[model samples]
Target: SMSVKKPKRDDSKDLALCSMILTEMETHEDAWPFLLPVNLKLVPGYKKVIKKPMDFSTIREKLSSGQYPNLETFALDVRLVFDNCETFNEDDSDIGRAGHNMRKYFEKKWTDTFK
Candidate 1:
């Protein structure tokens, strides 16, 4: 039972899917680098590279707060974590490889769940 806002894209199904995606991402071992927002001071120049930083914690909060209009929108944020990681770390590094692994899992699960 859902109140139709746009009727085309808004649905509880998307909300539930987003929640499930976030949960799996959280429990994933490779999720460590993306669990929290990067520390600007510790990371040094992180703020200079990624214009908009997104992390799992922020995504969880957004999910709980009904910040996403649909799963696709939520995916934009989810993808941002990996995108930022790739932008910041080399593909040969530990964090870089984890980003690859996490993103790969996310994409596969996304296709399985939605398509």
Candidate 2:
């Protein structure tokens, strides 16, 4: 019998994608899971993010702890966007430009305040 695997809610894929994105972000201090439910608010009317810049160090000290539990937590919901707002390395293996682009975008999208 021929069987096709339908797309189901996948944790592994999401996790992996987050990991790669964060790694490229170049920091491990902050995570984005807490922002998931509110993520929609971040990008208004944008269902699918073609390109959104990010930084991987929102919570700097928290990430550099070098602890297992912290690492686990970071891996779960990392946003890959740091506060420094730097450029991405082309050779890196991750979603490099998403963070950088998103930052510049939202900054101008909302003047003064946006969340």
Candidate 3:
């Protein structure tokens, strides 16, 4: 017997929810650092060290193009931005602080929406 033909789940609400969260993240005061890919010239060896760079623009591309089947993956990428920030920058500095603040903001929004 053939196995079940599994397709992407029809979580209709995930797109709009993910899209809205992305908008908020893009506009937040702390979002400036993450709005675009980090400039390689600005930070030496960044290209060599951080193998996978994540940013809001890239998230917008993937999230809008249905690259994520559901919200869990969507949220994971959003979280990755801040984690990557921590790796490349010191926490006491502005960029690092932005990472912490934006992560806090995203978590609250996720909790407020889902919990």
Candidate 4:
């Protein structure tokens, strides 16, 4: 049997993509209510995040401070917030559709963002 290994991803490029999404969301604030989960604050240090709009400043700070192990890890951590969009919104509301769209946006631009 043979095993395949994935190439290492560049953290800076990945962070740039994350930053782009945040910037767009900054203009389209309405998309946010559909973006995050209600229970994010219960995840401990994220209490303040629920109180404010989705800002990637903390993420930028954490990346600068070396809080995450790697770019892949950081990206995965960010995605956790939107992980349940399909189920949570149930495909009926506009918010649900918007949420799904943003998630797909990330997926679509992921490679180009890094390149």
Candidate 5:
């Protein structure tokens, strides 16, 4: 039988970090434009698909609704939004660095909180 590997991290810490970054991105007017995907300019129904200025309240609602039952699932959703940026290069791009910094913050917080 295969051995199951349990996650070494805590969910609450991750969720807290996620909430902090998401809330910052949602509320900060400067961060709003960077949150949008580059393809939005070329796509027609983009406005319909993503209301003016991206709103991540849905993710928060999902969190409360149990849609994200784990930190991994929640992180995936958050990363997807950042990854959608046209020039999404984790090592390059300003927005990419912002996302990376958030990840770093979460990791540090998680390590400090649980360890």
Candidate 6:
């Protein structure tokens, strides 16, 4: 909620909290009650999933080693995300709109902020 920036280390707790907020962002309002409590833990996993680098070698290794976690789904999600970068019409409007905008905006902001 605070617009003020925090150091990257400080963001862990905030990210944990934001993961909970993600529940509110979901379309299935029906599930909110059950989701609120687990937000912090749920967030870490989701965050880890997303923080993965944009590279194919790791995915290729996963496939070759037969150790992929839902390899097919992962491939689809990664490709679909990039393919729809301009706009992905998903149930989560936040991702297509705010997430994309915020990422670009912040990247530029940080680039300038550090310069």
Q: Candidate 4: worst 10 consecutive residues by lDDT?
A: 49-58
Write the residue-wise lDDT of candidate 5 on 1-115 in tens digits. 3787776554556666666655655665445434444465676665555542322565677766777777667666665554443333445767666656655554564455445
Off by over 4 Å in 1: 1-10
Which whole-number lDDT from 0 to 100 does residue 47 have in model 5? 51
Residue 27 of candidate 3: its Cα lDDT?
A: 90
Clashing pairs in 5: none
| lDDT of candidate 6 over 23-76, digit per residue (tens) | 232333332222222233554544344433332333344345645444234344
| Model 5 alpha-carbon drift over 4 Å, by segment | 1-17, 34-55, 87-115
Alpha-carbon lDDT of model 6:
0.37
**What's the TM-score of each model vs. the native?**
0.88, 0.24, 0.87, 0.53, 0.46, 0.24
Please give the lDDT score at residue 36 for candidate 6: 24
lDDT of 3: 0.90
**What's the C-alpha lDDT at position 54 in model 6?**
30
lDDT of each: 0.88, 0.37, 0.90, 0.55, 0.55, 0.37
- Candidate 3: misplaced stretches above 4 Å? 1-10
Error of 2 at 22 (Å): 0.9
Give residue 14's lDDT in candidate 6 (0 to 100). Answer: 33
Cα distance off (Å), candidate 3, residue 36: 0.4
| lDDT, candidate 1, 65-110, per-residue tens | 9788777788899898899999989999999999999999999989
The order by descending TM-score is 1, 3, 4, 5, 6, 2
